[PDB]
Amino acid sequence: VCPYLEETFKILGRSWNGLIINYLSRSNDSSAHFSDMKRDLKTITPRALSLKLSELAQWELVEKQIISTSPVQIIYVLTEKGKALAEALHPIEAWAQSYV
Amino acid sequence: VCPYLEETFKILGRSWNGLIINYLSRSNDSSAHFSDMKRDLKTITPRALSLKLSELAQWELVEKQIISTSPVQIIYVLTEKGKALAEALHPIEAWAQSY
Ligand SMILES: *c1c(C)c(O)c2ccccc2c1O
Numbered sequence: 001v002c003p004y005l006e007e008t009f010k011i012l013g014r015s016w017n018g019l020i021i022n023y024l025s026r027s028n029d030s031s032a033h034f035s036d037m038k039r040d041l042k043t044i045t046p047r048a049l050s051l052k053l054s055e056l057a058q059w060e061l062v063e064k065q066i067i068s069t070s071p072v073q074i075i076y077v078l079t080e081k082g083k084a085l086a087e088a089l090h091p092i093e094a095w096a097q098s099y100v
Numbered sequence: 101v102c103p104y105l106e107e108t109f110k111i112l113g114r115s116w117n118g119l120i121i122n123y124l125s126r127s128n129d130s131s132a133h134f135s136d137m138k139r140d141l142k143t144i145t146p147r148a149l150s151l152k153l154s155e156l157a158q159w160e161l162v163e164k165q166i167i168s169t170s171p172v173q174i175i176y177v178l179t180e181k182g183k184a185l186a187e188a189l190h191p192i193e194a195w196a197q198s199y
């Protein structure tokens with residue numbers, strides 16, 4: 001509980017990760033990504049995007065299912081843990097806006 | 101609304117910081133003397149406690165107050181921003197607990 005939180009923070013602390021599960025929760029229409037726009041533009045290399053998605057996946061936030069190689073089509077759908085984490089996020093997100 | 105959250109989390113990702121914040125939330129007037137914290141957190145070296153407190157200070161989450169009740173007191177208080185944060189953390193605690 002202690003180092004789970006400290007670690008989750010630390011993940012959240014790193015840059016994309018916070019923004020990514022915003023998308024997964026919000027921009028999704030069926031709680032899956034399918035790499036759409038392979039992200040919406042933004043300042044980020046998919047070298048480092050790919051890195052972050054991996055981090056999410058390792059922390060069971062996200063799961064990936066390769067639908068079809070023959071061409072390769074990849075989802076990136078969010079888990080319960082992830083969904084929940086996004087749900088827990090909302091108050092600190094709100095707070096962040098008050099102080100900025 | 102963005103990397104302020106990233107920045108905040110980054111601080112929270114640090115070794116004692118989240119705990120210190122939680123402690124203070126749970127302390128009366130959201131305020132603890134240095135040595136209260138030091139014993140209460142078992143394992144923190146007071147080098148560290150200071151360093152951490154400075155960080156959260158710099159962040160504007162904690163205020164250090166010198167009370168000139170001289171025999172002295174030094175207290176660390178949670179700022180409205182800090183207190184508000186602590187509140188904000190609670191769903192995340194809950195989440196972690198569930199897993
Ligand atoms: C460890 C523990 C045991 C608790 O209770 C919290 C609460 C809030 C933020 C961070 C914590 C850590 O790291």
Ligand SMILES: *c1c(C)c(O)c2ccccc2c1O
Pocket residue numbers: 015017018019022089093101102103104105106
């Ligand atoms: C930046 C933005 C714009 C948003 O929406 C979130 C949401 C949740 C965690 C972190 C975020 C960051 O850093």
